[PDB]
């Protein structure tokens, strides 16, 4: 499992200059500590799309949509261990798994090297 540190300096305030000179109060408010789950979802999405993909700008690609659905599937599984009776989220997870499997089948039929 990935371990994003709470002081990750989230991407909305990561690519801006003059961020390391500011004090620890502003850095703590702009870090992943004071953030919700969506900011960690974005950080995990970029951390996976940087290392798994070869063209992080090509979002409409099949291998990009697969790695974009993988983080949603993992967040749904993280939600499911805490909410067992959540049938709507169980349905979202069981349908996102089928959509990722359909995209994996199309990627296996189109580009086997990227599929492997």
């Amino acid at each position: 499992q990935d371990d994003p540190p709470p002081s990750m300096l989230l991407l909305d305030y990561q690519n801006v200059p003059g961020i390391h000179k500011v004090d620890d109060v502003v850095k703590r408010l702009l870090s992943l500590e004071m953030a919700n789950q969506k900011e960690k979802l974005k950080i995990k999405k970029m951390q996976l799309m940087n290392k798994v993909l070869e063209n992080p700008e090509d979002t409409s690609s099949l291998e990009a949509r697969i790695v974009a659905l993988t983080v949603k599937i993992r967040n749904y599984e993280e939600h499911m261990q805490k909410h067992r009776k959540d049938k709507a989220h169980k349905r979202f997870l069981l349908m996102s798994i089928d959509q990722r499997k359909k995209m994996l089948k199309n990627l296996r039929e189109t580009n086997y090297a990227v599929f492997e």
Binding site: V25, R28, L29, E33, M34, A35, N36, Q37
Partner: protein, 122 residues
Amino acid sequence: PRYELALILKAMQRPETAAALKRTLEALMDRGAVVRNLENLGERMLPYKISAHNQRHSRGGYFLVDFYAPATTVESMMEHLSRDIDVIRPNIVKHPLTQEVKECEGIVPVPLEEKLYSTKKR
């Protein structure tokens, strides 16, 4: 400001209010939250007799503490404030300054719905 604590403290004297506010702010800081500002809304009459801690409260001092806190330490501060015998009714909400105001466009003229029935001669 991220979160807002609409604190209703028991109507007490000045040093007791100051010690209750000191310990409430210190408990807010122990959880890993920085405090932005503290606004005293004044001591008014309660709209209804609030029964808290085996006490019938008719008055109460209103305070507003805004602060940046992680999403995990809100419920713990709520359990901390639920057991305090100097708080009448604690409530932590999102700050209204977080949601940007939208363009209230105004009343759009909606016409009367037509073609709801066929053109049969009655």
